[PDB]
Structures are given as structure tokens and as C-alpha cells.
Write an enzyme that holds these catalytic residues in place. Structure first.
Site, short mmCIF file in Angstrom:
data_model
loop_
_atom_site.label_atom_id
_atom_site.label_comp_id
_atom_site.label_asym_id
_atom_site.label_seq_id
_atom_site.Cartn_x
_atom_site.Cartn_y
_atom_site.Cartn_z
N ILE A 321 1.47 -1.52 -0.70
CA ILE A 321 1.16 -2.61 0.22
C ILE A 321 -0.29 -3.03 0.02
CG2 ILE A 321 1.18 -3.31 2.64
CD1 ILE A 321 3.31 -1.33 3.21
N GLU A 363 0.91 4.46 1.96
CA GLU A 363 1.28 3.06 1.90
C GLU A 363 2.03 2.72 0.63
OE1 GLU A 363 -1.28 -0.08 1.38
OE2 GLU A 363 -2.05 0.62 -0.54
N1 LIG Z 1 -0.52 3.20 10.19
C1 LIG Z 1 -0.43 4.15 9.10
N2 LIG Z 1 -1.26 3.94 7.92
C2 LIG Z 1 -1.19 4.89 6.79
C3 LIG Z 1 -0.35 5.97 6.84
N3 LIG Z 1 -0.49 6.65 5.70
C4 LIG Z 1 -1.40 6.01 4.94
N4 LIG Z 1 -1.82 4.93 5.62
C5 LIG Z 1 -2.70 3.83 5.43
O1 LIG Z 1 -2.80 3.50 4.16
C6 LIG Z 1 -4.26 3.50 3.79
C7 LIG Z 1 -4.47 3.98 2.49
O2 LIG Z 1 -3.93 3.11 1.50
P1 LIG Z 1 -4.91 2.02 0.70
O3 LIG Z 1 -4.43 1.71 -0.70
O4 LIG Z 1 -6.32 2.57 0.58
O5 LIG Z 1 -4.93 0.68 1.65
P2 LIG Z 1 -5.24 -0.86 1.14
O6 LIG Z 1 -6.36 -1.43 1.98
O7 LIG Z 1 -3.97 -1.67 1.30
O8 LIG Z 1 -5.70 -0.78 -0.44
P3 LIG Z 1 -5.52 -1.98 -1.56
O9 LIG Z 1 -6.83 -2.70 -1.76
O10 LIG Z 1 -4.48 -2.98 -1.11
O11 LIG Z 1 -5.11 -1.30 -2.85
C8 LIG Z 1 -4.86 4.48 4.92
O12 LIG Z 1 -6.32 4.24 5.10
P4 LIG Z 1 -7.00 4.76 6.50
O13 LIG Z 1 -6.37 6.07 6.92
O14 LIG Z 1 -8.48 4.91 6.29
O15 LIG Z 1 -6.72 3.61 7.65
P5 LIG Z 1 -6.50 3.96 9.24
O16 LIG Z 1 -6.92 5.38 9.52
O17 LIG Z 1 -7.33 3.00 10.07
O18 LIG Z 1 -5.04 3.79 9.57
C9 LIG Z 1 -4.23 4.20 5.96
O19 LIG Z 1 -4.73 2.98 6.64
C10 LIG Z 1 0.53 6.21 8.08
O20 LIG Z 1 1.26 7.15 8.14
N5 LIG Z 1 0.46 5.29 9.17
MG LIG Z 2 -3.24 -0.75 -0.73
#
Ligand SMILES: Nc1nc2c(ncn2[C@@H]2O[C@H](COP(=O)(O)OP(=O)(O)OP(=O)(O)O)[C@@H](OP(=O)(O)OP(=O)(O)O)[C@H]2O)c(=O)[nH]1
Ligand SMILES: [Mg+2]
Ligand SMILES: Nc1nc2c(ncn2[C@@H]2O[C@@H]3COP(=O)(O)O[C@H]4[C@@H](O)[C@H](n5cnc6c(=O)[nH]c(N)nc65)O[C@@H]4COP(=O)(O)O[C@H]3[C@H]2O)c(=O)[nH]1
Ligand SMILES: Nc1nc2c(ncn2[C@@H]2O[C@@H]3COP(=O)(O)O[C@H]4[C@@H](O)[C@H](n5cnc6c(=O)[nH]c(N)nc65)O[C@@H]4COP(=O)(O)O[C@H]3[C@H]2O)c(=O)[nH]1
Ligand SMILES: Nc1nc2c(ncn2[C@@H]2O[C@@H]3COP(=O)(O)O[C@H]4[C@@H](O)[C@H](n5cnc6c(=O)[nH]c(N)nc65)O[C@@H]4COP(=O)(O)O[C@H]3[C@H]2O)c(=O)[nH]1
Ligand SMILES: Nc1nc2c(ncn2[C@@H]2O[C@@H]3COP(=O)(O)O[C@H]4[C@@H](O)[C@H](n5cnc6c(=O)[nH]c(N)nc65)O[C@@H]4COP(=O)(O)O[C@H]3[C@H]2O)c(=O)[nH]1
Ligand SMILES: Nc1nc2c(ncn2[C@@H]2O[C@H](COP(=O)(O)OP(=O)(O)OP(=O)(O)O)[C@@H](OP(=O)(O)OP(=O)(O)O)[C@H]2O)c(=O)[nH]1
Ligand SMILES: [Mg+2]
Lengths: 445, 448
Positions: A321, A363
Site C-alpha cells: 500500500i 502493509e
Molecule cells: N493501522 C495499522 N498499520 C500497520 C500495521 N502494520 C504495519 N502498519 C503500517 O504500515 C507502516 C509501515 O509500512 P510503510 O511501507 O513504511 O508505509 P508507507 O508510508 O505506505 O511507505 P511507502 O512510501 O508507500 O513505501 C507502519 O508505520 P508506523 O507503525 O510508523 O505507523 P503508525 O504507528 O502511525 O500506524 C504502520 O503505519 C497494522 O497492523 N495496523
Molecule cells: Mg508503503
């Protein structure tokens, strides 16, 4: 595909058993000397060893003891083949560490009953060994003693004798009324001993009743059978008894069979009611409801191997995502979880049920598509992208709506020698490149 | 003890089927007309319905349709008994909602094979239904029998092509002629394996036995295409662990029915064991202590107390509450408190019999259900437990700290014929209350 090692000095005996066992779809290795047997056991690490006690030079008891001293062969069940009035032979075998016994002349019914029961035990043993190895890296009575044994028999003398024989090593309870026994068997019972030759109730009907209800479907049951009635003996093995005990009941045979059943039950209960319910050995993501990386890893291993042998390839889609951090930053973690759940539903609904839509990361999602080509996989990825990006995601119980984009990386097990890891690696490269080259895109490697 | 309803107009047939099934330890009800069958089905809620298609007045197809319209009988598998000339009968039966078919004259082998397959399916069906009801009072993936990956292990190309074509409209079929390659494939994401027992270049039963020998494929659904003449092969296939058999030549409707049943059973089972059984509300073991939980105890105690009411040795219960656990948390943290609970669980299990049930009743409360024991002995056992807990300290913080724990115990035992699990646990609770009032580090017994 169970590997059995047959050990005896007389060639005819070994060959006869080998013939019977191979006819019952068993892989049979043979040894004609004690030392040869021990070496072969350490080399092949078999599943079951059938060893005759009457062997010139090294007697079967010594071989059994040596097998139980080597830590690489101690787990392997060993059955000692004794002769008539081999009560002393059986006593020495129990002192030697034999798992169970077979009497000569060999009864095919008894032989295959023992082999089947102990092969099932070996399955559970091997599983626990594997899981212990994993758990050592961080990602409980297991003996056969001290068990509650329910004796369902109308013969008071036989019941008393059986309870006495089991009274120092186990905890026996005697029941003569089949209905009361059914009630008790639904409780904390480890093994049920039923008399198939009972005259006031049909022990086989009682056993079938146990196997009919899920509460008692897997309760270990041993049946005391009269050696004359081969028919009932076979029928008891068919209604679902785990092993049989000849009448008159030999104490050492009883001890061996009871311990085997109790240990199997304890191992199985530990593996399925404790270990399998651990958070590290789970196979389903509780939030999304999809499978996790563990499940896909195993399945992908088998798929990729088949592909290496030649045939249609296995394709992989890695979907990440885009800007999920913003979803959480603006609408909260709970709405993000809602988005993840709905994404999982949409994904599963727009791929085949023969496919494997799983949650690769937090994600990130993976779609393992069996018998799929890279070109078709890219088209499927475009379909998924359009379905996710096109329709908005409604959250906050209808209060708000959000639009989601995804970056996809496509890979396929094309050509021979490919490995699960390489396939996933190529898909990851695709995801990285799609995220660099803008977003809302599919990239194939 | 699975309940089967046999429906046919001819009394002789009904009696014959009843005799065979009851001889195989089955509870059999009989109906000779459609209306009676429907009423009995809605009342007794059978497990399997064996229904003859040819019945004066209400035909078997109509009965099947009506059963599938009633939301109380829709779940029950229905087997339609047809005649030799049954292609139209089978097509109409499938359109009516039949689970599978049996042909007359009845082959006992096939009869018991179908009954076994569908009773197993009924077990998982009932479990799923119970879980759904629970989630309703406490408040995905494909649960149909279609769209499955079916592996056809056959060297007979004409047969393989026909089965793949017939299954290519509702399912995703794959054909394998080499048994080894097929073994590898069967270890993967396969829903059903169809093997030719009468294969010409390999022993289909050997392949099946190999699948059942390995744990990865031990429970993989397998249907075996068998020649009706060689009864021995059919019996052996059913013994090695085949789920059902298909007669050759393969009838399309029979193929469809059996495939759907096996795939749906697999899906139900996987959903119940890999998703629902791993949910936190259906757990049976506490993750922290490693002991069983209140749910497990409740079931076992029901069986035990029922036995006791019927007359015999009594069942005793021990309710153990740690004293001043809040102080432990306030002083050393919840993590140290968790360590204390873990070690307490180990000691408790180690100082009572394995036939006993040491479980976690509450957060800091533990229960020891002791089968076949009297209140006096139970009180002495409680004293043993108390001394073991108070005597030795509990080491926590990776050895950095040592702490002493006391416990208050309430003991009770099943009395008379009207006692209930709840009453026994209540009396033990009263004992715990009194022990907490009367100082602590004490055991108190309550008897009705
Ligand atoms: N709501 C929810 N979010 C999840 C879960 N597991 C992983 N994530 C989310 O997914 C993020 C990690 O994926 P990334 O690839 O870094 O996110 P993107 O910004 O989409 O990157 P991209 O630039 O698109 O490649 C986490 O960062 P943070 O933990 O820092 O964000 P928080 O703690 O606020 O929820 C979480 O926000 C879950 O079980 N529930
Ligand atoms: Mg992402
Ligand atoms: N593992 C996997 N592979 C997929 C998937 N989607 C497409 N493919 C693969 O891509 C091939 C071409 O599919 P198509 O171009 O869309 O053209 C397809 C499509 O139009 C149709 N089709 C088959 N199944 C379905 C379905 O379930 N839904 C819809 N709407 N069409 C289907 O039949 C055509 C041929 O399909 P196939 O012969 O099987 O050959 C398919 C298939 O192997 C998928 O979701 N999972
Ligand atoms: N464009 C395209 N989409 C695909 C393809 N394969 C799978 N899909 C998508 O995945 C959805 C689920 O397919 P399924 O789970 O296998 O479950 C499917 C499948 O079981 C069945 N179906 C439709 N046509 C076929 C077919 O040609 N062959 C088989 N074996 N099943 C089909 O209908 C079910 C629902 O299908 P859908 O409503 O279409 O919704 C399908 C479809 O959107 C494909 O090859 N091409
Ligand atoms: N459900 C349950 N009941 C218990 C437990 N501990 C004691 N009892 C009950 O209390 C009876 C008397 O046990 P005892 O006075 O300590 O005197 C006992 C004890 O000295 C000895 N014994 C039996 N099993 C064991 C054991 O596992 N370990 C030790 N050290 N002694 C045992 O044999 C004597 C007689 O025991 P039984 O005849 O079977 O009769 C026992 C038993 O029914 C328990 O942990 N769980
Ligand atoms: N069939 C049978 N087995 C015996 C007997 N004596 C010892 N054992 C077995 O050997 C295990 C170890 O007993 P423990 O070390 O004294 O450690 C025991 C002991 O400390 C205590 N316990 C159990 N029963 C009694 C009892 O009757 N009286 C007393 N005072 N303590 C008992 O609970 C511990 C665990 O007992 P278990 O889990 O059942 O595990 C016991 C039990 O299975 C016996 O007389 N008959
Ligand atoms: N560390 C830890 N504590 C647990 C756990 N499960 C239950 N508890 C704690 O155990 C306490 C329950 O004990 P009580 O029945 O209230 O009685 P106690 O005061 O301990 O002794 P008493 O018999 O009345 O003299 C609760 O304290 P509080 O409800 O006040 O909350 P917190 O634990 O945060 O303080 C629970 O939180 C657990 O898994 N880990
Ligand atoms: Mg307390």
C-alpha cells in the site's frame, strides 16, 4: 513411505517379513547382525525397528540397549520379536527399553497393528523434535506414566488383574456399565481399555460410540481381544481401536501398549493445544483473516520444487500500500486496521481461491498464483490495482471515505532450479522500482 | 451413534437398510412417505438422510427440495438412492440439492463409504454451526465446495482428460501422470487428489498410502477411481485412507457431488482449525502459565460431576488465590508478576497428580479439579500445596530478585445426586472468601 529396519539372523525370517511389509507399502531395510543393525540405524535413521531377541553373538536385548544408548537412535521405536512363553523375554525387553513386543509365530494382524500404531507415534515424535529445534531459537509431562486408564469390562477378575498390573505405574478406574463409562470417557481419561469379548455389552459398539462423538473421537482405546476370534480382532481394528491386547493379558504387553498410547496422546495434545496456539506458530493473520508468511513459505516451497522438475510456473505478486503512514496519521491506527481488513477482502475476492492471498508484512500482501505465467501475472496485477485504486474505501462506520493506491511487483518461477527466496526477491525488486517510478504502478522482474 | 433417516415407500427396502446400518452401529429412523420424512427431519434433526427418488405422491426430489428450503434441515446431507438408469435422476437430484447418490441394488461397500464420508462432514458442519451461534451471542474465506485445485493422478489420458473437462467448469483441475511429481504437487496448495487405483504404470493405492504416510499430506482429501468388479481393491483403498471411491466409468454427477463434499469438508476443517481454533475466545490453554483455562475445566467438570451424580467416587475441587498479588505488581512490575504466575503454575502441576486438572481459573486464581477423591484427602492435598508454595521462594528478574508468596485455598467436593459443577465451584469460592477473612495462608472446606 515409512522406513522399517528388520533385524534377524535367519535370512528366511527377514525376507518373509520384508515381503509382507513391502506388500503393505512400507520401505524395508534389512540387517542380519546386531552390529550391522546398529550401524544401519545410525546411517538411515529409520522410523521403526523390528528386532528378534534370538540372535547368535549379540542378542536382541543388547542391540535394543545400544539403540537406546545412542542419542541419535533413542527416539526410534523398537519392537522386540519374542517366542511363546517369552514372559522372561518380555521382562528383559522392557528392561532393555523395547517399545512393544511381537510373539512368534507372527500374526499378520498383530504385526500390522503394532506397525501402524508406532508409525503414528513416530509421526508425532518427529514433529515435536522439529518444533523443539525451532523453539530453541525462540521462533509438561511427556512420559507415558501416571495416566488415568478406564477399564470397561464386566469380568471383575480380569478388571481387577488389569488394574493391579497398571496400579503402580498408572491410575486405573474400573467401570462395568457402558453408559456410565461413556460419561466418564468424556472426562479426564487418558486411555480406555475395553473388553471386545464382553458378554453383557458389545465393547465394539461402545468403541464405535466413542469414535462417533467428537468429544471422544480421538480418545486412545485399547481392546482386549480373544485370540480365537480373528474376525472381532480385525473388526475392532476397523471401528477405530489404536491397538489390541490378547487374552490372557500379559503384564509386560499391557505396560508397553498403555505407555505408547499415553505418550502419543500427551505429545499430540502438547503440539496442538499448546504449541500450535502459540503466537509464533500461527498460520492466519487475525486482523486481515488471511494466511501469514509461514503458510506461504511452506506452500511456495512445494510449488517451486514442482516447477523446477518442469511444468507450468508459479507466479508471485507483492503488493505494498502507498502512503499508509498518512492513513494512520490522519484517521488513526484503528481506521488503518479497517483499511487493511477491507483490502484483504477485496484482494481475496479478485484472485482465485486456488491462489494464496497472504499478509507478507504489515502493509504488504503477497499473492502466490500456482500454474501462472509472468505475462498473465502482470495482467492480474493490473486487475487488482484497478479494483483497489478505483473504488474508495469507506471507513469510520460510513462517516469518512479514503482512496488507496498500491505498488505491485511481479515475479515468476521461470526456468529450472529457481528457489522461493529468489522469486520473492525479484518481486521485492519490482515493488521498490514501482515505488521509485512514481506510485500506483506494477513492475515485473 | 450418528443418526440416519432412511426414506423409501417399500417397507422391505427400509428394513434392509435399517438392518445393515444398525449392524454397523448406527442409530436408524425410518419413514415411508415424504411428509413423514420431512416432519421427522425437522424434529429429530438427523445427521444423514438416505432418500429414495422413486416414491409415490411426493417424489424424492421434492422431499430434497423441501429439506433444502427449511433453514432447520438445510445443513443435513441428503443421499438420493437411484436406479441403474439414473443420469436424469442424478442431474435432477443435483438440481434439488442432493449431497451424493447411491445406486440400487445397494452395494454395502459403497453404502458405508458414503455414510462415513458424510458423517465426518456432518461433524465439521455441526462444529461450524455452533461456533457461528457463539459469535452471534458474542457479537472471509470460501466455504462452498467449488473453485478448488484438484490433482488428477492418472496415466489413462482419455479418463484424465474427461475428468479434467468435467471438473474444469466448476473447479481448477491439474493432470499428473508421474506419481513422484504428483507427490510433490500434493504437498502444495491442493484441495483434492483424484487417483486411478487401476492405473497401468503405477499402483494408485501405493501413491495414496505414501500420501497418508507423510504428515504434510496425511489429511489431504483423496478420491480413488475404482473398477466396480474388483471389490478387493475398493476395500483396500478405503482402508489405506481414501475418503471415498468413484466407480469406473466415472459418472459426471457422481464426480461433481463427491468432489464438492470433499472440498467443502476440507474448507470447513481448515477454517475451524487454522482461524477459529486460534482465536483468543476458543482457546483451551493459558499462554502465560501453560496450563489449561476455565473453558477446558468447565467441560471436563461437567462430565465428572455427571458421573458423580450417577453414583460413585466423588470429585473434589481446589480454588487457590494468591495473597497480596497487587503488592507484587505494585512493587516489582507486571512482568515480574507474570513470572511469579508462571512458576506458581509449574509448582502446582508438579505437586498434584497428572490425572488431576490444574487450570487457571482467573487472573491470579487457579483451580485444581481432582477426580475420584474425597474431601478429607483433598484438604490434605491443599495443605501439601500450601506448604510447597509458602516454603520455597520464587526467583524472578533473571535471578536478581526473590519473593515469597502465600495462598488461600477453598476446598469442596461433589455431594449427592443433584450437585452441579456450579455448586461445587461456589462452595469452593465460599471457602476462599472465609480463608481470606480468617487471616491468610489457610485452607477452608465447605460441604453442602
Ligand atoms: N493501522 C495499522 N498499520 C500497520 C500495521 N502494520 C504495519 N502498519 C503500517 O504500515 C507502516 C509501515 O509500512 P510503510 O511501507 O513504511 O508505509 P508507507 O508510508 O505506505 O511507505 P511507502 O512510501 O508507500 O513505501 C507502519 O508505520 P508506523 O507503525 O510508523 O505507523 P503508525 O504507528 O502511525 O500506524 C504502520 O503505519 C497494522 O497492523 N495496523
Ligand atoms: Mg508503503
Ligand atoms: N492462478 C491464477 N491465474 C489467473 C488468474 N486470472 C487470470 N489468470 C491466468 O491467466 C490466464 C488468462 O486469463 P484471462 O486473460 O483473463 O482470460 C481467462 C478469463 O477470461 C476466463 N476465466 C477463467 N476463470 C475465470 C474467473 O474466475 N472469473 C472471470 N471473470 N473469468 C475467468 O477464462 C480465460 C482463460 O483463463 P485460464 O484458461 O485458466 O488462463 C488464465 C489463468 O491461467 C487468477 O486470478 N489466478
Ligand atoms: N478477468 C479474470 N478474472 C479472474 C480470473 N480468475 C479468477 N478471477 C477473479 O477472481 C474472482 C474469484 O474467482 P474464483 O475464486 O476462482 O471463483 C470463481 C470461479 O470459481 C467461477 N468461474 C467463472 N468462470 C470460470 C471458469 O471459466 N473456470 C472455473 N474453473 N471457474 C469459473 O466463478 C467464481 C467467481 O468468479 P468471478 O465472479 O468472475 O470473480 C473472480 C474473478 O474476478 C481470470 O482468469 N480472468
Ligand atoms: N486426585 C488426587 N488424589 C490424591 C492426591 N494425593 C493424595 N490423594 C488421595 O489421597 C489418598 C491417600 O494418599 P496419601 O495419604 O498421601 O498416601 C498415598 C501416598 O503415600 C502413596 N502415593 C500414591 N501416589 C503417589 C505419588 O504420586 N507420589 C508420592 N510421593 N506418593 C504416592 O500412596 C498412598 C495412597 O494413595 P492412594 O491409595 O491412591 O489414595 C490417596 C488419593 O486418593 C492427588 O494428588 N490427586
Ligand atoms: N500409579 C502410581 N504412580 C506413582 C505412585 N507413586 C509415585 N508415582 C508416579 O510417579 C510420579 C512422581 O511422583 P512424586 O515424585 O512423588 O511427585 C508427586 C507427589 O509429590 C504428589 N502426589 C501425587 N500423589 C500423591 C499422594 O498420593 N500422596 C502424596 N503425599 N503426594 C502425591 O504429586 C507429584 C506428582 O504425582 P504424579 O503427577 O501423578 O507423577 C508421579 C506418579 O505418576 C503410585 O503409588 N501409583
Ligand atoms: N502481573 C500480572 N497480574 C495479573 C494477571 N492476571 C491477574 N492479575 C492481577 O492479579 C490481581 C488480582 O488479585 P486480587 O483477586 O484482586 O487479590 P489480591 O489483592 O492480589 O490478594 P488478596 O487475596 O485479595 O489478599 C489483579 O490486580 P489489579 O486488578 O488491581 O490490576 P494490577 O495487577 O495491575 O494491580 C490483577 O491485575 C497477569 O497475568 N499478570
Ligand atoms: Mg489475591
Amino acid at each position: 513411505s515409512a522406513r522399517i529396519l528388520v533385524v534377524d539372523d535367519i535370512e528366511a525370517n527377514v525376507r518373509l517379513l520384508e515381503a509382507k511389509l513391502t506388500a503393505e507399502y512400507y520401505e524395508v531395510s534389512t540387517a542380519m547382525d546386531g552390529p550391522t543393525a546398529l550401524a544401519m540405524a545410525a546411517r538411515d535413521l529409520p522410523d521403526i525397528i523390528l528386532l528378534d531377541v534370538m540372535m547368535p553373538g549379540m542378542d536382541g536385548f543388547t542391540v535394543c540397549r545400544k539403540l537406546k544408548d545412542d542419542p541419535t537412535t533413542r527416539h526410534i521405536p523398537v519392537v522386540l520379536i519374542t517366542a511363546l512363553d517369552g514372559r522372561g523375554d518380555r521382562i528383559q525387553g522392557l528392561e532393555s527399553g523395547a517399545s512393544d513386543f511381537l510373539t512368534k509365530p507372527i500374526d499378520d494382524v498383530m504385526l500390522f497393528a503394532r506397525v501402524r500404531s508406532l508409525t503414528r507415534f513416530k509421526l508425532v515424535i518427529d514433529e515435536l523434535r522439529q518444533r523443539e529445534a525451532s523453539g530453541r531459537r525462540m521462533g509438561a509431562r511427556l512420559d507415558g506414566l501416571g495416566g488415568r486408564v478406564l477399564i470397561v469390562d464386566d469380568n471383575e477378575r480380569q478388571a481387577q488383574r488389569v488394574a493391579a498390573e497398571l496400579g503402580v505405574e498408572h491410575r486405573p478406574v474400573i467401570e462395568s456399565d457402558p453408559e456410565k463409562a461413556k460419561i466418564s470417557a468424556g472426562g479426564p481419561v487418558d486411555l480406555v481399555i475395553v473388553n471386545a469379548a464382553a458378554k453383557n455389552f458389545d465393547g465394539l459398539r461402545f468403541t464405535a460410540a466413542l469414535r462417533s462423538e467428537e468429544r471422544t473421537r480421538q480418545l486412545p482405546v485399547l481392546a482386549m481381544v480373544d485370540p480365537d476370534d480373528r474376525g472381532r480382532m480385525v473388526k475392532a481394528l476397523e471401528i477405530g481401536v489404536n491397538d489390541i491386547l490378547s487374552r490372557p493379558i500379559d503384564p509386560q504387553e499391557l505396560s508397553a501398549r498403555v505407555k505408547t498410547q499415553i505418550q502419543r496422546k500427551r505429545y499430540t495434545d502438547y503440539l496442538r493445544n499448546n504449541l500450535d496456539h502459540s503466537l509464533e506458530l500461527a498460520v492466519t493473520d487475525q486482523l486481515t483473516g488471511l494466511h501469514n508468511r509461514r503458510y506461504m513459505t511452506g506452500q511456495l516451497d512445494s510449488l517451486v520444487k514442482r516447477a523446477t522438475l518442469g511444468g507450468d510456473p508459479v507466479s508471485a505478486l507483492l503488493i505494498d500500500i502507498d502512503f499508509f503512514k498518512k492513513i494512520n496519521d490522519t484517521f488513526g491506527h484503528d481506521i488503518g486496521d479497517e483499511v487493511l481488513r477491507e483490502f484483504a477482502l477485496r484482494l481475496a475476492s479478485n484472485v482465485r481461491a486456488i491462489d494464496l492471498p497472504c499478509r507478507y508484512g504489515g502493509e504488504e500482501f503477497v499473492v502466490i498464483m500456482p500454474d501462472t505465467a509472468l505475462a498473465d501475472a502482470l495482467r492480474i496485477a493490473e486487475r487488482i490495482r484497478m479494483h483497489v485504486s478505483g473504488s474508495p474505501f469507506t471507513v469510520a462506520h460510513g462517516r469518512e471515505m479514503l482512496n488507496v493506491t498500491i505498488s505491485i511487483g511481479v515475479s515468476a518461477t521461470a526456468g529450472e532450479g529457481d528457489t522461493p527466496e529468489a522469486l520473492l526477491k525479484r518481486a521485492d525488486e519490482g515493488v521498490y522500482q514501482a515505488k521509485a517510478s512514481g506510485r500506483n504502478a506494477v513492475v515485473g522482474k
